[PDB]
Design a protein around this motif. Structure first.
Motif: not given
Lengths: 271, 263
Positions: A73, A75-77, B3, B5, B38, B40
Motif C-alpha cells: 500500500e 507504493l500508492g498502487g 516511484i 504511477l 486494476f 488493490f
C-alpha cells in the motif's frame, strides 16, 4: 484509484557458438530494465532508453511479450512488469539461456537435472491429497511427471509450476541460476515466444549474419528450440514459407550462402 | 526513492458468433468495451477484469488470454484480454471495422479508404515511397494482396493518417482507444484460427463440418476453400466424430490443453 507502477524489462537474445544468449546487466543477475516514465512516448521507446544506458548495445526490432502483476500500500498502487523480446547479433553481460534454464535444453538428450526436478515435483504433488490429481495433471502437461511428452513451448508454465512448488530460489530448493526480481519469469516468456515463432515461421534474420548457410540456420534454430531439428522438415518449412534465397556465393565442404528475402525484412519493418 | 504511477485499465474483448456474424461484448450502448481499473483487492489482472465484466454485463466468461499492453496516445496503461464465449452482444466486429469483412468480396468502403490513404501518402513527397509501401502492405494501395491478420496495423495507419475519429472517420468510433484494443483482439483470433483453430468455446457441443467453416469464415472475414479448410482440421487433430447427425466435436485433449495453458 487503479494506479500502478510499470517496469519495462528487455529479453534481448543473440546466438553465439550455437548457444542462445540473453543480454544481462548486474553481472548476469538481472535483465536490462527500467521504469516507465511520463516523458516516455511509448512503452517500447521507454525500454529502448533503458537498454541504451545500461548496455550501450544496439537493438533492432522489439515485440511485446507479456504483462505480469504483483501478488504494498505504501507504493500508492500495484506494480506491473512488461516484457519485450529482441533479437540481435552480439557485439563486443552475455549469458546463456540454459544457465538460467538448464532443463530447457534437450539437444543432447534429456538433461539429468530433470530427474531431480521430477522427484521434487512428485513429492510436492503428493503432499496434499485433495490436490494430488490436479497437480499431477499440471506436472505431467509441463514436465511429464506421469509420462507425458515434452513440449518445448511450455517454458513459462514450467517455471511458474516450479515457483508455485517452491523449487526455484525466487519462490523462497532451487534449480538453475536465479535472477533478481521476477526476471527469470520474463526470460521464460521470451524463450517460449521465440519457440512458438520458429515452429511456424522462423523469421530470425536479426540473429544471423547478412548471409548464412542452411546448416548455420539449422543450428541456430536448434539452439533456440533446445532440440535437434529434422533436417528435411526444417528445409521444407523454410521453402514453403519463402523465407530465404541464395545469394550466389559459396562458403567453406562447400555450401551455398542464403539470406532472408527483402520482403521478409519489409514485412517485419511495417508490423 | 521516487516511484512514478500511471492509471492501469483492464479492457475486455469478449467475442461470440451468432447468425454467422462475429460480435463483441460492449457496454454503454455499444460505445465501449467492458473496462475497469486494476485495484488493490484484485488478486490478478484476469480476476480484476472478470469482476468488471460481471459487474457491467452479468454475462459469464470462459477462458481469458492476455492480448496487448498499450500506453496512452498522468499516463494510462491499458491491458486488453481476449475471451471466447457462447452468447451486450448486439454489435458485431464489422460495425466498428467494416473494411475487415471481405467474405462478400472486397467491401465498397475500401474504395473511399484507398482514396483518402493515397492523398495522405502523396501529401509529403519525401515520405511518399514509404507511405505507399505501408498502405500497400496493410490495405493494398498499390495493388498488394489482402492479409486478414493485419487488422491492428491497418487501424493504426488510419489513426496516423487521421482517417478515424479517435485521431474523417470510417466505422463506428469507440471511447478512448478501445478500437485499438478490439483490432488487437481481432488480429489475435485470426492468427489463431490460421495455424491451429481452437474455438470450442465459440462452437456448440456438437456441430457439422460446414458450420465450423462459416464460423471460421466469420472470424477471418474471408470465405475459405472447402477442401483446404478440412485438410487443416484433419492435420492438426482437433476434431472427432460424434456418431450422431456428420456431427463433430472438439477432442478432449484440446479442451484439457487449454485448461492447463492458463492465460
Amino acid at each position: 484509484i487503479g494506479l500502478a507502477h510499470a517496469e519495462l524489462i528487455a529479453v534481448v537474445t543473440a546466438i553465439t557458438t550455437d548457444e542462445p544468449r540473453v543480454m544481462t546487466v548486474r553481472e548476469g543477475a538481472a535483465l536490462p530494465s527500467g521504469p516507465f516514465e511520463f516523458g516516455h512516448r511509448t512503452l517500447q521507446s521507454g525500454l529502448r532508453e533503458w537498454i541504451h544506458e545500461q548496455t550501450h548495445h544496439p537493438v533492432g526490432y522489439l515485440e511485446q511479450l507479456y504483462t505480469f502483476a504483483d501478488r504494498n500500500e505504501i507504493l500508492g498502487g500495484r506494480t506491473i512488469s512488461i516484457g519485450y523480446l529482441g533479437l540481435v547479433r552480439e557485439q563486443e553481460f552475455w549469458h546463456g539461456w540454459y544457465e538460467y534454464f538448464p532443463w530447457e535444453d534437450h539437444r543432447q538428450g534429456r538433461p539429468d537435472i530433470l530427474d531431480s526436478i521430477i522427484d521434487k515435483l512428485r513429492a510436492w504433488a503428493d503432499s496434499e491429497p485433495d490436490s494430488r490429481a490436479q497437480r499431477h495433471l499440471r506436472a505431467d502437461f509441463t514436465f511429464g511427471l506421469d509420462g507425458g511428452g515434452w513440449n518445448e513451448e511450455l517454458t513459462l508454465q514450467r517455471y511458474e509450476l516450479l515457483y508455485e512448488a517452491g523449487l526455484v530460489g525466487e519462490a523462497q530448493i532451487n534449480f538453475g541460476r536465479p535472477m533478481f526480481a521476477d526476471h527469470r519469469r520474463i526470460l521464460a516468456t521470451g524463450i517460449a515466444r521465440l519457440r512458438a515463432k520458429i515452429k511456424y515461421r522462423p523469421v530470425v534474420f536479426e540473429l544471423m549474419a547478412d548471409s548464412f548457410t542452411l546448416l548455420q540456420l539449422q543450428r541456430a534454430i536448434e539452439a533456440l528450440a533446445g532440440l535437434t531439428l529434422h533436417k528435411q522438415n526444417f528445409r521444407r518449412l523454410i521453402e514453403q514459407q519463402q523465407l530465404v534465397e541464395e545469394t550466389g556465393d559459396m562458403a567453406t565442404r562447400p555450401a551455398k550462402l542464403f539470406r532472408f528475402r527483402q520482403t521478409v525484412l519489409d514485412e517485419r519493418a511495417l508490423s
